[PDB]
Amino acid sequence: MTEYKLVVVGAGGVGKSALTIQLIQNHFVDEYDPTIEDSYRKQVVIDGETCLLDILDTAGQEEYSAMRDQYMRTGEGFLCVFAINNTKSFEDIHHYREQIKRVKDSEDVPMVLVGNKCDLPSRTVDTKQAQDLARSYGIPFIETSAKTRQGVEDAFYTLVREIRQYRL
Ligand SMILES: Nc1nc2c(ncn2[C@@H]2O[C@H](COP(=O)(O)OP(=O)(O)O)[C@@H](O)[C@H]2O)c(=O)[nH]1
Ligand SMILES: [Mg+2]
């Protein structure tokens, strides 16, 4: 049974928990404690392949978690999330990518840049800025809305496709 272990990272408030809950449970949760870190597993079909997703929704807290360490060590791909109406969260992306590179001791880790909250009209990070950053890292950029589901499967499934390419 094919399995893909994914990790969702990025600044507090960008929609990591809402994106993960949307993917797994097909609804938008508008309040979810920003300190809760949990994993979610689901059987899905991606490009006709039945597979298991095993996703860590990180929360950036200081307390030790053996599970968190395990997902960093064995996680196969990472979503790096910012919000398109939060310039600071976009400025914070580079730090998350640098951490992931250190965990893997590698420049080539399957990764997707995710610009969430694209349903909102107050866009302060434009598509070109994000596309240029993604191009600099050599990774895809996907715009998402956890509220409407726009791009949500694309973001996670694109990550799965990046993993598939890496495995070859
Ligand atoms: N409009 C909008 N609000 C969102 C979206 N995703 C998350 N939110 C809201 O943004 C806030 C932070 O979301 P949350 O999932 O807790 O973010 P996390 O701290 O990254 O886990 C909450 O108020 C969510 O309701 C989205 O796509 N659109
Ligand atoms: Mg959260």
Q: How many domains does the chain have?
A: 1
CA 149 to chain centre: 14
Residues 148/27, Cβ–Cβ less than 8 Å? no
Burial class (CB in 10 A: 0-12, 13-18, 19+), 102: exposed
Residues 155/116, Cβ–Cβ less than 8 Å? no
CA 141 to chain centre: 11
Which CATH number belongs to the domain containing residue 95 in this structure? Answer: 3.40.50.300
Calpha distance 86→161 (Å, rounded): 28
Calpha distance 28→50 (Å, rounded): 25
Q: Which residues contact 135 (CB under 8 A, 6 or more apart)?
A: none
Ligand 1, atom 7, residue with closest C-alpha: 15
Identity of the amino acid at 17? S
Is residue 49 marked as binding?
no
Q: In terms of residue numbers, what domain contains 57?
A: 3-167
Residues with CB under 6 Å of ligand 1 are 12-18, 30, 32, 34, 116-117, 119-120, 145-147
Calpha distance 101→76 (Å, rounded): 12
**Residue 53, CB-side half-sphere exposure with 13 Å CA sphere:** 28
Q: Which of 117, 122, 143, 152 to mutate to test the pocket of ligand 1 (most atoms within 8 A of CB)?
A: 117
Q: Which ligand is nearest to the CA of 152?
A: 1
